[PDB]
Amino acid sequence: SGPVPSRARVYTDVNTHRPREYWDYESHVVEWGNQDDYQLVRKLGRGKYSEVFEAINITNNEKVVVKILKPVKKKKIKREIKILENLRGGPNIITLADIVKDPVSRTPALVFEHVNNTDFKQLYQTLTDYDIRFYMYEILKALDYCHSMGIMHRDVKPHNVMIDHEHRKLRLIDWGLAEFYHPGQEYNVRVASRYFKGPELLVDYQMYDYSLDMWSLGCMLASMIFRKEPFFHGHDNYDQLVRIAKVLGTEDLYDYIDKYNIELDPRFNDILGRHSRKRWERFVHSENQHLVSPEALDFLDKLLRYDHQSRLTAREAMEHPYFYTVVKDQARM
Ligand SMILES: Brc1c(Br)c(Br)c2[nH]nnc2c1Br
Numbered sequence: 372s373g374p375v376p377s378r379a380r381v382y383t384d385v386n387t388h389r390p391r392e393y394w395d396y397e398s399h400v401v402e403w404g405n406q407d408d409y410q411l412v413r414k415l416g417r418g419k420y421s422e423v424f425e426a427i428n429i430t431n432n433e434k435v436v437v438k439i440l441k442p443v444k445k446k447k448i449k450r451e452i453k454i455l456e457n458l459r460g461g462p463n464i465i466t467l468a469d470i471v472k473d474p475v476s477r478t479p480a481l482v483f484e485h486v487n488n489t490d491f492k493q494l495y496q497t498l499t500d501y502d503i504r505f506y507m508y509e510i511l512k513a514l515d516y517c518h519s520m521g522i523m524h525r526d527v528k529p530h531n532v533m534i535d536h537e538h539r540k541l542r543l544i545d546w547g548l549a550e551f552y553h554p555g556q557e558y559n560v561r562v563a564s565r566y567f568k569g570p571e572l573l574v575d576y577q578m579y580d581y582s583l584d585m586w587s588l589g590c591m592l593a594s595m596i597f598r599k600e601p602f603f604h605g606h607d608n609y610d611q612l613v614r615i616a617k618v619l620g621t622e623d624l625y626d627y628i629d630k631y632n633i634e635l636d637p638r639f640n641d642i643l644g645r646h647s648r649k650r651w652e653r654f655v656h657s658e659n660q661h662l663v664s665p666e667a668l669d670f671l672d673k674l675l676r677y678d679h680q681s682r683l684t685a686r687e688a689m690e691h692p693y694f695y696t697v698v699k700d701q702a703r704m
């Protein structure tokens with residue numbers, strides 16, 4: 372019959388206990404500022420929905436980042452804004468400084484407190500064992516926070532992590548795909564980038580939660596420790612699941628299909644095949660063995676699960692042995 376419902380293991384009802392205004396972003400009223408308070412200096416990047424610039428706030432000569440939004444439905448703009456306002460001041464979350472419109476074109480833009488244009492993809496293939504653990508732990512602070520605040524990011528990838536490596540400092544950015552978690556809500560599966568899409572998205576299971584972000588985290592982690600970019604390298608969304616299947620095995624995949632009574636797209640009938648669950652040692656070689664430990668593999672194994680309910684929560688992840696020396700060094704400092 373229909374697909375079996377799912378609920379988050381943690382932070383399940385947090386939005387329900389909030390005032391409506393917290394999560395009812397469609398009702399949020401934006402007070403739009405004047406973009407002529409800022410002067411654009413140089414282009415930092417391009418996105419699907421946005422042109423990103425370094426700018427100066429004339430009023431105080433502070434450097435900022437201006438994300439000029441390419442046109443899109445007002446609904447999506449309010450969602451990003453409301454989420455950013457709700458998470459402001461949270462650990463390792465990018466800080467929204469201002470919301471503005473160009474007076475002539477009327478194009479909306481978000482102004483963020485300045486952080487370096489060096490995304491994580493630019494150096495996550497060259498880090499030491501300790502630094503991978505350090506920066507992973509820092510990303511986990513952001514995810515545990517946003518999840519505790521009733522929000523899933525849905526676009527966790529190296530490009531959305533800004534690192535100031537000189538200052539051992541990190542910001543989770545681009546909340547334009549993030550959404551509020553509500554028990555029983557069915558969500559859009561066209562989210563995240565191919566290589567970081569969780570199996571729920573790939574088999575069209577809509578009642579997903581915070582655990583989505585933990586799959587993506589696992590994908591990042593595997594890429595870093597095995598020096599393999601990306602770890603799951605699909606040609607498209609169908610072949611993406613096949614890539615996962617060749618590592619995680621088809622047995623746990625079908626058990627997962629059956630548990631949630633998922634109707635599998637028939638394009639998958641021919642291509643998934645039958646594969647054993649592979650031991651992680653298979654991806655260890657001379658150029659990456661220094662980043663790989665029993666702790667790292669145990670942790671990774673507990674992130675990369677078909678069944679979203681089986682994956683570690685961000686808090687559970689932060690308590691894994693992999694981070695013991697990070698936690699000890701943090702208390703010291
Ligand atoms: Br580059 C960059 C920076 Br810096 C920030 Br902050 C962004 N926020 N959304 N998209 C962003 C991009 Br692309």
Ligand SMILES: [Cl-]
Pocket residue numbers: 492528529530531
């Ligand atoms: Cl990326």
